[PDB]
Amino acid sequence: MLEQPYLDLAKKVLDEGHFKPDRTHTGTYSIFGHQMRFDLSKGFPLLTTKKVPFGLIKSELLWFLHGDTNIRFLLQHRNHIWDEWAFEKWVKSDEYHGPDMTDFGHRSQKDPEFAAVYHEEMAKFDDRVLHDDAFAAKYGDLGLVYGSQWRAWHTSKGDTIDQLGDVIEQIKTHPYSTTLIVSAWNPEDVPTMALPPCHTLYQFYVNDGKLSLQLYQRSADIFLGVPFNIASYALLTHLVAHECGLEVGEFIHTFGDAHLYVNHLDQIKEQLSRTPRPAPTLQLNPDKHDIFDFDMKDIKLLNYDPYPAIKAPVAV
Amino acid sequence: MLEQPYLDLAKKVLDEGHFKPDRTHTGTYSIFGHQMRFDLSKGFPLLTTKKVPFGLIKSELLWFLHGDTNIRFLLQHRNHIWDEWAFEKWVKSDEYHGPDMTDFGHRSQKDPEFAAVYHEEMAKFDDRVLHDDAFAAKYGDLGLVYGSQWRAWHTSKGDTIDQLGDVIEQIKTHPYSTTLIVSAWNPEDVPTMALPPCHTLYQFYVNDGKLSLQLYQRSADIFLGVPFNIASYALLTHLVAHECGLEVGEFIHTFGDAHLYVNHLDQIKEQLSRTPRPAPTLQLNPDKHDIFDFDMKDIKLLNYDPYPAIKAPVAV
Numbered sequence: 001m002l003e004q005p006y007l008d009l010a011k012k013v014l015d016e017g018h019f020k021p022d023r024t025h026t027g028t029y030s031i032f033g034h035q036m037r038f039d040l041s042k043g044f045p046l047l048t049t050k051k052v053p054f055g056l057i058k059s060e061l062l063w064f065l066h067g068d069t070n071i072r073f074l075l076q077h078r079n080h081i082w083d084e085w086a087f088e089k090w091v092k093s094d095e096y097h098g099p100d101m102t103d104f105g106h107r108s109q110k111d112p113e114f115a116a117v118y119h120e121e122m123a124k125f126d127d128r129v130l131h132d133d134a135f136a137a138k139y140g141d142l143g144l145v146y147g148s149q150w151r152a153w154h155t156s157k158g159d160t161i162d163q164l165g166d167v168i169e170q171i172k173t174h175p176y177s178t179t180l181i182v183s184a185w186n187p188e189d190v191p192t193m194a195l196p197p198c199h200t201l202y203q204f205y206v207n208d209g210k211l212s213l214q215l216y217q218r219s220a221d222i223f224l225g226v227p228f229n230i231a232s233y234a235l236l237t238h239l240v241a242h243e244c245g246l247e248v249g250e251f252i253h254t255f256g257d258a259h260l261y262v263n264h265l266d267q268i269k270e271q272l273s274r275t276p277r278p279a280p281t282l283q284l285n286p287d288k289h290d291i292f293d294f295d296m297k298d299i300k301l302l303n304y305d306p307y308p309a310i311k312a313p314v315a316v
Numbered sequence: 317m318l319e320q321p322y323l324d325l326a327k328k329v330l331d332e333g334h335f336k337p338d339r340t341h342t343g344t345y346s347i348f349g350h351q352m353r354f355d356l357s358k359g360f361p362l363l364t365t366k367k368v369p370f371g372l373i374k375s376e377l378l379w380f381l382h383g384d385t386n387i388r389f390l391l392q393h394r395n396h397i398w399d400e401w402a403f404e405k406w407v408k409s410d411e412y413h414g415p416d417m418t419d420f421g422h423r424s425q426k427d428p429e430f431a432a433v434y435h436e437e438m439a440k441f442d443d444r445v446l447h448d449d450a451f452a453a454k455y456g457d458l459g460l461v462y463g464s465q466w467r468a469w470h471t472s473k474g475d476t477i478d479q480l481g482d483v484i485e486q487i488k489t490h491p492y493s494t495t496l497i498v499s500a501w502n503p504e505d506v507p508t509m510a511l512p513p514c515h516t517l518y519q520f521y522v523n524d525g526k527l528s529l530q531l532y533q534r535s536a537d538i539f540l541g542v543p544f545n546i547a548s549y550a551l552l553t554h555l556v557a558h559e560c561g562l563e564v565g566e567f568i569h570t571f572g573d574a575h576l577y578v579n580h581l582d583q584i585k586e587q588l589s590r591t592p593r594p595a596p597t598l599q600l601n602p603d604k605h606d607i608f609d610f611d612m613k614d615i616k617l618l619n620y621d622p623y624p625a626i627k628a629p630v631a632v
């Protein structure tokens with residue numbers, strides 16, 4: 001089936017992954033270097049052996065294309081994937097007069113009481129961002145997230161670059177260019193950042209009228225992460241290809257440190273006893289063509305019939 | 317935030333604007349009568365939810381203050397905002413021996429071939445204006461543009477009036493005058509003109525040592541137009557106030573027909589999902605005080621961090 005590459009990755013890491021430590025001291029089985037390709041003409045690679053919320057992905061990917069960097073848009077679509085990073089900034093803010101939220105990540109996980117006080121501060125934080133225009137601007141703005149690196153890369157001269165905007169044109173004018181690249185990795189920022197980009201840089205390629213894309217990911221969470229990562233990028237391949245009026249091609253996913261947190265072994269094994277089903281199909285608005293102006297209703301998933309979801313703990 | 321007034325205008329026109337036809341048959345959503353104020357002590361109102369080229373504005377506004385009316389100055393600063401109106405005159409000129417450029421506006425938009433021949437004639441036109449002193453004088457001179465109405469209004473007696481020059485003095489001698497007005501609207505010209513002034517007339521006001529300005533705009537393009545219009549006039553408020561040695565006040569923008577071309581609906585909606593960021597600041601040369609003698613380097617924008625630009629078609 002279409003998803004086999006991922007399943008094979010799970011087995012490979014369970015089979016020859018060596019024990020390697022990580023920043024959260026949770027332990028992982030690692031492998032360095034790996035590549036799997038997906039033929040998007042055979043179907044959309046959204047794992048059927050485990051329910052993956054396409055909503056969260058699409059609303060987050062559009063967030064990126066808009067070049068946005070503020071959480072307010074995500075909370076507007078009930079997307080909490082980036083909350084923690086913003087919250088962290090409100091907490092260490094001198095305007096913060098409330099309970100000590102130092103290292104809330106681990107504390108909430110162990111202490112069941114902190115898990116309530118931490119969920120109250122968050123619930124109201126998301127509220128301020130959502131209603132207090134100024135608060136939103138002040139804390140809801142992450143700043144150095146994918147949206148601004150893709151569409152507002154800062155020059156030494158003082159201005160900004162629309163990498164993706166520019167690349168999309170070179171595809172229409174010079175489809176055979178071996179320089180259809182976008183980079184989220186900037187050396188003068190990386191060391192200051194909390195989480196330097198996992199999705200380092202990607203490349204587009206065009207032959208026989210088909211658009212293919214390769215993604216270099218410096219680090220990967222096999223269980224929780226990869227499922228979303230595969231879908232974000234294969235969807236992008238589709239949108240970019242839609243604007244350029246090209247046929248869809250292949251999504252090549254290359255890896256640096258593909259790892260598996262140890263607290264996921266049972267959950268990963270259980271998914272492997274599952275047999276993939278036929279893959280779903282993507283349906284994009286035929287009329288509308290400016291992908292940068294696309295909204296939810298413009299992108300729709302068809303025939304997704306996934307197995308029941310699989311719960312697991314987040315390494316923090 | 318500072319820019320909210322404009323965002324509210326976009327929503328209002330999307331909400332209660334009735335369908336009204338226009339000269340370009342492109343269709344617009346109109347509203348008659350509206351007013352928004354900007355407190356310039358809170359920051360410069362240059363939209364952050366969309367990148368707006370401050371360069372084009374400043375170089376065009378100085379063009380006005382110099383009382384100039386010839387395009388050569390604009391092309392000297394790579395400003396093509398007024399090219400079309402001059403080009404039109406070269407085209408219908410009997411000295412014009414080249415391809416039929418009748419109604420180039422629509423033809424270039426639809427026909428992709430005309431869009432190249434039209435771009436060649438223009439490229440060389442801008443060249444003649446730029447090098448052939450006589451050609452410049454002959455076609456590069458628009459004549460009845462803001463620069464001459466502001467600074468060289470023609471009397472029935474035969475001479476000329478420096479409205480702005482005169483008003484600037486009455487501000488220094490009689491700061492409390494309720495007649496600090498400038499008009500670009502002249503009844504004996506209007507019916508012959510291609511595009512009668514959109515920026516009809518403006519008024520200055522002074523209290524507590526602060527200079528405020530009101531602008532009456534008979535017609536407005538919400539998406540493409542207004543962003544530039546807000547910045548031109550708020551910058552003027554600053555310069556005039558600089559010469560008169562006054563504190564900056566409020567910029568009141570009043571409207572006649574504020575409309576939205578239908579081919580901008582998606583682009584306008586996308587901008588509304590964006591959350592404004594803090595506004596930039598203006599920095600004017602402290603030494604130099606004769607605004608009429610100001611040049612680019614004398615006016616500088618600080619901390620402008622706009623969202624990525626938004627492309628859209630020009631109603632023609």
Ligand SMILES: O=c1ccn([C@H]2C[C@H](O)[C@@H](COP(=O)(O)O)O2)c(=O)[nH]1
Nearest residue numbers: 022023198219220221225226228229
């Ligand atoms: O979409 C995602 C989000 C996160 N991660 C993971 C990679 C790491 O597990 C952790 C970040 O810490 P590093 O191991 O990269 O240093 O987040 C992914 O693989 N994909």
Ligand SMILES: O=c1ccn([C@H]2C[C@H](O)[C@@H](COP(=O)(O)O)O2)c(=O)[nH]1
Nearest residue numbers: 338339514535536537541542544545
């Ligand atoms: O800076 C500008 C330039 C142009 N326009 C618009 C107004 C109209 O959309 C068009 C001129 O035709 P009228 O609708 O005014 O007749 O140009 C503005 O609002 N602001």
Ligand SMILES: [K+]
Nearest residue numbers: 183184185186
């Ligand atoms: K780089």
Ligand SMILES: [K+]
Nearest residue numbers: 499500501502
């Ligand atoms: K008048």
